[PDB]
From a paper:
We report the structure of tDGC from Thermotoga maritima, an important enzyme for the large scale enzymatic synthesis of c-di-GMP and the first GGDEF domain from a hyperthermophile. Cellular levels of c-di-GMP are tightly regulated by the opposing activities of diguanylate cyclases (DGCs) that synthesize c-di-GMP from two GTP molecules and phosphodiesterases (PDEs) that hydrolyze c-di-GMP into 5′-phosphoguanylyl- (3′-5′) - guanosine (pGpG) and GMP. C-di-GMP synthesis from two separate GTP molecules requires dimerization of two active GGDEF domains, with the loops bearing the GGDEF motifs of each monomer brought in close proximity to initiate the cyclization reaction.
Enzyme assays showed that tDGC is active even after days of incubation at 30°C but with very low product production, irrespective of substrate concentration, due to feedback inhibition. The R158A mutation in the I-site abolishes feedback inhibition by preventing formation of the inactive c-di-GMP-locked dimer.
Residue numbers in the entry:
A (entry chain Z), D (entry chain V): 94 to 246
B (entry chain U), C (entry chain Y), E (entry chain W), F (entry chain X): 93 to 246
The structure:
Amino acid sequence: TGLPNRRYFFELGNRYLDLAKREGKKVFVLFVDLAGFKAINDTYGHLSGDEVLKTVSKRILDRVARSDVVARYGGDEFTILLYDMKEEYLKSLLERILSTFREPVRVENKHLSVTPNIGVARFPEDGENLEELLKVADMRMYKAKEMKVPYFS
Amino acid sequence: LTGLPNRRYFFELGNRYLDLAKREGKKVFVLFVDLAGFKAINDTYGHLSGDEVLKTVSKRILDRVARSDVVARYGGDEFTILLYDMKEEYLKSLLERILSTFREPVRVENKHLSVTPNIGVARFPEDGENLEELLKVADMRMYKAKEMKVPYFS
Amino acid sequence: LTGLPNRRYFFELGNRYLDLAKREGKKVFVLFVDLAGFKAINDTYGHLSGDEVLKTVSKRILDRVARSDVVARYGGDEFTILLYDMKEEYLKSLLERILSTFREPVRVENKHLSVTPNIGVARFPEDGENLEELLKVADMRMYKAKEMKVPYFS
Amino acid sequence: TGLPNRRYFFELGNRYLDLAKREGKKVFVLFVDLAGFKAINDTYGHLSGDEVLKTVSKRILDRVARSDVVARYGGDEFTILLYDMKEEYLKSLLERILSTFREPVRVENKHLSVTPNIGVARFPEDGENLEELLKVADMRMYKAKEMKVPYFS
Amino acid sequence: LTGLPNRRYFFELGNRYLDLAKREGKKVFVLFVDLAGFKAINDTYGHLSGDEVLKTVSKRILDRVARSDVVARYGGDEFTILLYDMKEEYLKSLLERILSTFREPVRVENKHLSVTPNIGVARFPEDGENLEELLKVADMRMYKAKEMKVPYFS
Amino acid sequence: LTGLPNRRYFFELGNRYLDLAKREGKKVFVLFVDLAGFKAINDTYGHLSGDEVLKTVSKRILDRVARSDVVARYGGDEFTILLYDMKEEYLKSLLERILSTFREPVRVENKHLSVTPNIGVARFPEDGENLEELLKVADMRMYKAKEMKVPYFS
């Protein structure tokens, strides 16, 4: 995928929060869960599930700003960090990300489907560190997941 | 094939929708979608490739509009969408989700073909009293968007 | 040439009208108009005479419905009318004005040809969720009217 | 049959009338009704009724001039348009058309009979458009039909 | 077979018709009908096929003449028709209706056989005082029509 | 919607007009009208703009021809006009009045679009015995006019 991991996300993440604390800005933390992924690998194997992960990554990467931090958390999960962005930018970004996953992923001669579920947290309101914000965002994506809605902010 | 209706069907349904809006005191949005890069697709890869892109483009629009929204192919790089009594919020979101879909280069065969979307919006009654007038305003506004190198003009 | 649309057009517009009514929380009336005496008109006077009567019948319906009402010819002795969000009062009056029009034997050439109207009504959502369902209820109700020797059944 | 329909007849028809108006010529409009046809389909079916229509068409087509417009109106009905022809040409054409339908049509192992009824209208005398002339011709074929005579001009 | 009378019968009836016309001060038309393409039909398809064509040709002439008109087969491709006291209008129409039947290629078996009609006319008293004289004038006139590639000569 | 007939209608009416001219001993002019600048219009402004220009072009031709003159759209930049029994003076004048109409750039929306006319003429019988032959002569002559940078060639 080329996408960074949990450890990188955490280092950049907290620096972004330190910077926001000093500049008096907000930070949005998105927790993206792609349901249908545990079923893809358990049916088509790792290569197919990995090719879907590569498409998913490129799709997120192409839609975020240059200064936005995208990383893969683990399994069905990706994290996005937005430093000092308007709520309008967020609503639009969520819509454009959800729109991409309406398109079943073409891997080989297969047409694989993933459903997106996104939770949002805001710094400072939801927490003072990345671990706290991710748990709020994870709780909110799980609320969205169980409610059968695309996103919860 | 696309399954998508043509100019003639769009016009009949379109005007009925406007007649209904006139009576109910509602607004109607008319979107003019131009997909740049398409004239270069047929001139390089042929009709089948250009047509396979049209089939994907149609399915992509169809999957994102509401059941009561009218989608049709105007001609060439052009598609028209009609929204009866929808909030401006619904339109801004619909435009974003449609634009997002064309950022994805279309896979036709072993090719990865790119189209760029340009959309113009008109509102009934403000912009006109018939479908021909509204489409001309929307077409003028997508051409403003096209020359300005921006995605949409409302 | 009646100018009136066909079954295929009626179905596309029809279902869109139903999709719109579903969303807006409105009713739709579907009228099934059968003109008895028409099977005898062509078997006696020929197609041109029967067609000239169809042209008068069409113009008579068209002149009495609202701009937003959908009128189409189903087939043979049959016409369909779709009323989006109209009061029951509007319907009772429309049925009376349509029936009144066919009390008038149609003048084709030196002939004075008579047709008797039979109308069945269905209401969306009560009578069905699609156009084929509503047309069958309306058709069943016009046939009840036809056999009962009454003009309409709602 | 290969024969054009009502819509084609009307377009060519009116052009012929526009041309006659300018050139100071007459136009004959023939309305041909083939009685016995409603009984043919109600007994032998569409294929048999259609095979009779194919023979009827070829019979009319073979007897008119190259510049004469022949079309099927609908059901037992055919229309013929004669631009600038002598009344002698018309009397002869009517005789030759009536003569063909004295011959019962051979469809399969069947010998099917149709009776011709023709009405004539003349432009300008009978009307200024094709719709008017066809109604006069239709009225005159119906007079012929009820009178048990072959043609009325 | 055809049931049609022969040369010998035609001659007896023929002259009686002329005797009657002489006394009543009436005209008689004598038609000489030659059907070209008949010598080729028997030489290709045989006697039964050529005979079946003769049976159709006979019935076609018989169905188009008046009850008082004398029809007979002369010889090869030849038939004779006698019209007692008929208007010239009746003759022009009869010739047209006979020519019209032979434009229709004869269906014998799975074959579609073509015969071309050539008719010569003679008038009593002008052209002769007996049937032999009138038939020769009519035969000369059908031969003029045959060579001129026209249908009839009167 | 220009309302203008297509190639297949033009051909049927066209040949009938030629059949009629053959019999009456009259001439027929066949005009092949090409509108240069049209391929550039659709490739820059799109189909709606190019179509609105086609609607204006059609109405402009239709308003300048006689009631008995046949106007049709061939395809793309092309239109065909058929003149039955008209004087050469009528033709020279008609060509001048048609060329004069395209000197004024067409107004579609907020755009001022330019088309340049090229007309080729063929005469029946001199140039051919059917519509296909005459159209090829007219097409060759409009192409001679096109390359010569002149408006018309007869």
